[PDB]
Amino acid sequence: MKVINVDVAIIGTGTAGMGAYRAAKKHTDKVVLIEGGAYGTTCARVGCMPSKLLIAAADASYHASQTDLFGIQVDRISVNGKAVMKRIQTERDRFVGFVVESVESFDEQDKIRGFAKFLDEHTLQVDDHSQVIAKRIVIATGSRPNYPEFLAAAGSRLLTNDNLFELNDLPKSVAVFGPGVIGLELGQALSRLGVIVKVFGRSGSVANLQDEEMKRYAEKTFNEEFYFDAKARVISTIEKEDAVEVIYFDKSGQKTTESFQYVLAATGRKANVDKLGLENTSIELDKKNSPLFDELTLQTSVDHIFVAGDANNTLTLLHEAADDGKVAGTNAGAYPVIAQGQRRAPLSVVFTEPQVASVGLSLRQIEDLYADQDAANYVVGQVSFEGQGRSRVMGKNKGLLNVYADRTSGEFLGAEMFGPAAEHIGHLLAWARQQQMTVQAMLTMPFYHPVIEEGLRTALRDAQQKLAIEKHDMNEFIMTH
Amino acid sequence: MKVINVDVAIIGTGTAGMGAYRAAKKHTDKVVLIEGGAYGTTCARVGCMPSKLLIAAADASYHASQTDLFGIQVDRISVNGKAVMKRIQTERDRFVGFVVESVESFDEQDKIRGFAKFLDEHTLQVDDHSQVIAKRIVIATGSRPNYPEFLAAAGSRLLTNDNLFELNDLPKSVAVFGPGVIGLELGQALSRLGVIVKVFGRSGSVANLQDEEMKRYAEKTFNEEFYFDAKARVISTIEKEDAVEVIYFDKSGQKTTESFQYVLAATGRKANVDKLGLENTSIELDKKNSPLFDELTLQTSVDHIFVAGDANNTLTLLHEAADDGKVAGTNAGAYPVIAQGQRRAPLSVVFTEPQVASVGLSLRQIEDLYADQDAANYVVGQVSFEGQGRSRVMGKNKGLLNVYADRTSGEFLGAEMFGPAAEHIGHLLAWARQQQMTVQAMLTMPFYHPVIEEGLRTALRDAQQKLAIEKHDMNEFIMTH
Numbered sequence: 001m002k003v004i005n006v007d008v009a010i011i012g013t014g015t016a017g018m019g020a021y022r023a024a025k026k027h028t029d030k031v032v033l034i035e036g037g038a039y040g041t042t043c044a045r046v047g048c049m050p051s052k053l054l055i056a057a058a059d060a061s062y063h064a065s066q067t068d069l070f071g072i073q074v075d076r077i078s079v080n081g082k083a084v085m086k087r088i089q090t091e092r093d094r095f096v097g098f099v100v101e102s103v104e105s106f107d108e109q110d111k112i113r114g115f116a117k118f119l120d121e122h123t124l125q126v127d128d129h130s131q132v133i134a135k136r137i138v139i140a141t142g143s144r145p146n147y148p149e150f151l152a153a154a155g156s157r158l159l160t161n162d163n164l165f166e167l168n169d170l171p172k173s174v175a176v177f178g179p180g181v182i183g184l185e186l187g188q189a190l191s192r193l194g195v196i197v198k199v200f201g202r203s204g205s206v207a208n209l210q211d212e213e214m215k216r217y218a219e220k221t222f223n224e225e226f227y228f229d230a231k232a233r234v235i236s237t238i239e240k241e242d243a244v245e246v247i248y249f250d251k252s253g254q255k256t257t258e259s260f261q262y263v264l265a266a267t268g269r270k271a272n273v274d275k276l277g278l279e280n281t282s283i284e285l286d287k288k289n290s291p292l293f294d295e296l297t298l299q300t301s302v303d304h305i306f307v308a309g310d311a312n313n314t315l316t317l318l319h320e321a322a323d324d325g326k327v328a329g330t331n332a333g334a335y336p337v338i339a340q341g342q343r344r345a346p347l348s349v350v351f352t353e354p355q356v357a358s359v360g361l362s363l364r365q366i367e368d369l370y371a372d373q374d375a376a377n378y379v380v381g382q383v384s385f386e387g388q389g390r391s392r393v394m395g396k397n398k399g400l401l402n403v404y405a406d407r408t409s410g411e412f413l414g415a416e417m418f419g420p421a422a423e424h425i426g427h428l429l430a431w432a433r434q435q436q437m438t439v440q441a442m443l444t445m446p447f448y449h450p451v452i453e454e455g456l457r458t459a460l461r462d463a464q465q466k467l468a469i470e471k472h473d474m475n476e477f478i479m480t481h
Numbered sequence: 482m483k484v485i486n487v488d489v490a491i492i493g494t495g496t497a498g499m500g501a502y503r504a505a506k507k508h509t510d511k512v513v514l515i516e517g518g519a520y521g522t523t524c525a526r527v528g529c530m531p532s533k534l535l536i537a538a539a540d541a542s543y544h545a546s547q548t549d550l551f552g553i554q555v556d557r558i559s560v561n562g563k564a565v566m567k568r569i570q571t572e573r574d575r576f577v578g579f580v581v582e583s584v585e586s587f588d589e590q591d592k593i594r595g596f597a598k599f600l601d602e603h604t605l606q607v608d609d610h611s612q613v614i615a616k617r618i619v620i621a622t623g624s625r626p627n628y629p630e631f632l633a634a635a636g637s638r639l640l641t642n643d644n645l646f647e648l649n650d651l652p653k654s655v656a657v658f659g660p661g662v663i664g665l666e667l668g669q670a671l672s673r674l675g676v677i678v679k680v681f682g683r684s685g686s687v688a689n690l691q692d693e694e695m696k697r698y699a700e701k702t703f704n705e706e707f708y709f710d711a712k713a714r715v716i717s718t719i720e721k722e723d724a725v726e727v728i729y730f731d732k733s734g735q736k737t738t739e740s741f742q743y744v745l746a747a748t749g750r751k752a753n754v755d756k757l758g759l760e761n762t763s764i765e766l767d768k769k770n771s772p773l774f775d776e777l778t779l780q781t782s783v784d785h786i787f788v789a790g791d792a793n794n795t796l797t798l799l800h801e802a803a804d805d806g807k808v809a810g811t812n813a814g815a816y817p818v819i820a821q822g823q824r825r826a827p828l829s830v831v832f833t834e835p836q837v838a839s840v841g842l843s844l845r846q847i848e849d850l851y852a853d854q855d856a857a858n859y860v861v862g863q864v865s866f867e868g869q870g871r872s873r874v875m876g877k878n879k880g881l882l883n884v885y886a887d888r889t890s891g892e893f894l895g896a897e898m899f900g901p902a903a904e905h906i907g908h909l910l911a912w913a914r915q916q917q918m919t920v921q922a923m924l925t926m927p928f929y930h931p932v933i934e935e936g937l938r939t940a941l942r943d944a945q946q947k948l949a950i951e952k953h954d955m956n957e958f959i960m961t962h
């Protein structure tokens with residue numbers, strides 16, 4: 001067995017891992033990247049890229065059926081499932097190819113093929129062929145799909161993101177479990193593509209939305225289009241000869257048996273930290289067996305072992321994994337010099353229609369920091385997109401936007417939005433939060449006409465008029481003497 | 482003839498005028514609004530709203546024909562012209578009604594019906610019935626269509642924004658004339674709705690773009706969809722029995738005769754300041770008889786007479802007219818106490834597909850700013866939307882974006898974009914400009930994945946690499962120690 005010494009070993013050649021490698025190489029030449037599976041990152045392979053590709057097809061198909069409002073009729077929209085799948089697959093391959101070329105450009109001696117596990121706090125074994133002794137180690141192993149036990153009975157008809165995009169044809173029908181980002185994006189897209197869909201979640205959850213009014217509005221809006229029970233009681237999902245039989249109670253509590261060609265487990269993903277031999281370290285774990293970590297430095301309780309990307313089960317977003325990589329890589333490279341990452345303002349997006357964006361502090365974080373049981377030093381500004389001019393012009397007038405502000409200073413804290421162009425409004429808001437703008441300042445910014453951003457102006461005015469600050473600092477337009 | 486004294490008289494009850502009234506009424510009770518035409522504002526009646534309404538219908542129709550990229554096919558797309566025109570009309574009547582309700586709420590004695598002209602610098606006459614003795618006067622009379630003499634031979638078949646939206650049905654064919662941006666917005670929309678259209682522009686102009694490369698790429702792009710000659714040489718447009726005969730030279734310079742059902746003037750608006758009896762005042766005029774005015778205070782050479790909105794032939798955009806009304810109303814209301822408006826960062830949008838946005842300083846204004854245009858003290862960061870991932874996923878991968886930055890400081894100066902979602906990126910960029918951001922700082926902002934704003938990241942990196950700041954003293958991600 002070959003033994004190698006490195007300053008930095010990075011387990012996982014995904015987004016976080018490749019970011020960690022580039023960062024760590026600026027501090028030290030002695031960095032290895034280990035990869036047990038296919039190169040290309042989860043994002044380009046079976047993540048962001050194919051899912052967005054699926055969505056683009058779905059929205060082209062769906063919007064073609066919604067032109068009558070405008071005075072146009074479209075006859076026989078027909079979904080060629082083989083074509084839909086082929087396009088997704090070929091574009092997906094193209095994206096993966098770019099990552100593979102980057103991986104290929106790295107020094108051959110810096111890449112080791114195989115699955116790593118810890119033997120002790122400085123020794124990794126990769127398969128049965130190599131041992132790496134590393135001064136510092138970065139766990140960048142991502143997440144995998146995961147599902148409750150009952151879903152396992154769907155057998156060979158159980159889909160995840162790992163196999164959904166490899167189908168040669170679109171399915172006839174899919175039962176989707178998991179009411180979060182992936183589950184709603186994929187269920188809606190499939191439903192828009194002529195697939196018979198129902199989406200079941202259990203806890204009342206809708207995407208990552210925290211506000212109760214928002215969750216209910218979104219759930220009801222989705223149900224105008226396809227079946228979505230955020231509080232479903234599901235008995236079983238059992239593979240038959242040609243289908244999966246799903247036994248569940250509907251919204252009227254009526255027991256229902258219904259066959260679906262497939263089930264999709266868009267349930268909670270699992271961080272890849274359970275199969276890496278952590279029990280051979282003193283890494284402290286929470287009551288769910290997730291590694292505890294410093295959220296600024298990415299250090300576990302073992303100060304020379306870091307955890308980055310989906311592996312730390314936090315900020316499980318692509319751009320965040322990339323930032324995690326920079327933090328873990330720099331800190332692994334420069335150790336024992338340790339710095340804290342200055343995180344970008346939180347930005348989270350769901351590519352449904354209408355879209356969801358969450359920006360800045362979440363509602364729970366705001367309640368924690370700006371309120372208690374009996375008093376609040378924050379206010380909420382709101383707008384409905386139903387009566388918003390441009391949204392109505394486009395026939396997209398559905399949605400709600402909540403904006404949160406410090407009640408004393410007017411500092412913009414965060415937001416939730418379910419509505420059109422939420423992805424873009426999310427950026428606008430996220431840049432405003434990172435700059436620590438106040439709502440009064442943001443009201444002085446440009447708002448064109450007629451645009452969706454004007455809905456944001458409405459929500460900001462709503463918040464502003466609730467602030468403890470003087471009436472006469474409520475100028476939306478500044479004049480100087 | 483009945484005579485009234487006011488502190489402030491406002492000529493024109495559109496966007497600028499209604500704004501001026503509200504601002505003026507904060508300072509004094511004696512203010513009147515004079516209106517010669519229909520209430521509603523130009524924006525709501527025959528401007529932004531119905532044009533955006535036509536565009537949305539156009540977009541749905543066209544996108545319905547573009548589904549095969551994604552693997553979806555249609556049998557047929559059928560454009561019911563009458564329903565298309567009706568929805569535009571009913572929706573705009575809705576928007577107009579809101580404006581009308583506001584006007585109706587204003588004190589009866591604050592509103593005079595008729596066209597005003599100056600008898601002298603403190604006296605207005607409204608038609609033949611009223612004279613207003615006014616301490617301060619705001620000219621907020623908007624702009625009107627203007628076109629060369631040859632176009633007038635199109636007689637009852639000449640269209641402008643004033644009558645286009647009033648057609649009971651979509652025309653079979655329309656020739657559009659002039660360099661006006663409205664020509665591209667409306668021409669493309671008409672074309673996308675099945676109307677046979679040719680756009681004959683002038684002098685190389687393309688949607689107000691200033692960069693030579695951008696203009697050419699945009700003209701080429703548009704030409705993949707509809708006939709557009711930015712340098713057209715046109716002989717005549719003469720009304721016949723059921724159409725207009727257009728005689729012109731095609732793109733190879735050959736004299737061509739073609740019938741179009743209507744003709745649409747897009748030849749640049751005229752400010753309504755030629756029929757106000759301005760000869761009865763000492764107001765200083767430029768060589769094209771536009772009143773000179775202070776761009777910050779909106780005062781003419783006569784210090785108690787202001788000019789606001791499209792009337793001053795500057796920043797002829799809706800939200801800028803609103804700010805104009807605010808500046809002019811405040812200054813007219815509080816005269817002799819005068820203040821300088823602090824303008825928002827420039828933002829203009831052309832709602833074609835792909836969209837156009839210009840942000841901050843124009844290219845001309847940048848070239849002016851630098852004493853030594855040789856020594857090149859600004860940089861250009863560039864991106865093509867052709868290889869931009871999300872844009873490709875959506876089948877929207879056409880366009881370019883230039884960002885401008887000071888070479889020493891990296892101060893973000895302004896931008897031009899032709900690309901998907903330019904309206905939204907335009908806002909993000911305009912907020913960044915108003916907050917005086919550097920390109921270095923903008924790169925520390927959140928950029929989600931996979932999104933169109935990742936193209937902005939590419940362009941910002943391109944500018945940044947070119948800066949004279951210390952090469953490895955601008956990190957994209959900040960860490961503290």
Ligand SMILES: Cc1cc2nc3c(=O)[nH]c(=O)nc-3n(C[C@H](O)[C@H](O)[C@H](O)COP(=O)(O)OP(=O)(O)OC[C@H]3O[C@@H](n4cnc5c(N)ncnc54)[C@H](O)[C@@H]3O)c2cc1C
Pocket residue numbers: 011012013014015016017034035036037038039041042043046047048049051114115116117140141142143161182272275276308309310311316317318319321929930931
């Ligand atoms: C369907 C779907 C859609 C998504 N859409 C979006 C979106 O639109 N926007 C967004 O921001 N995020 C999206 N995400 C989330 C995003 O994909 C993740 O945040 C991101 O890919 C995580 O990056 P990573 O580097 O941590 O993980 P990965 O890219 O998975 O890297 C982990 C790597 O480590 C390897 N590995 C695991 N164990 C070992 C071992 N022990 N030894 C060696 N190698 C190992 C794996 O093979 C893998 O290559 C989506 C995710 C999914 C599943």
Ligand SMILES: Cc1cc2nc3c(=O)[nH]c(=O)nc-3n(C[C@H](O)[C@H](O)[C@H](O)COP(=O)(O)OP(=O)(O)OC[C@H]3O[C@@H](n4cnc5c(N)ncnc54)[C@H](O)[C@@H]3O)c2cc1C
Pocket residue numbers: 448449450492493494495496497498515516517518519522523524527528529530532595596597598621622623624642663753756757789790791792797798799800802
């Ligand atoms: C087709 C079209 C599309 C457009 N789209 C957009 C867009 O998408 N976004 C954008 O920002 N801008 C757009 N614009 C520009 C926008 O409409 C103008 O910037 C805006 O309307 C100017 O408003 P205003 O108050 O200055 O003029 P107006 O709203 O026209 O008000 C002037 C008023 O004065 C009255 N008047 C004139 N003379 C007299 C007189 N002597 N006595 C009494 N009353 C008088 C008129 O009747 C009118 O009511 C568009 C314009 C057009 C034509």
Ligand code: NA
Pocket residue numbers: 308309310311312313314315316320321324
């Ligand atoms: Na993470």
Ligand code: NA
Pocket residue numbers: 789790791792793794795796797801802805
């Ligand atoms: Na103006």
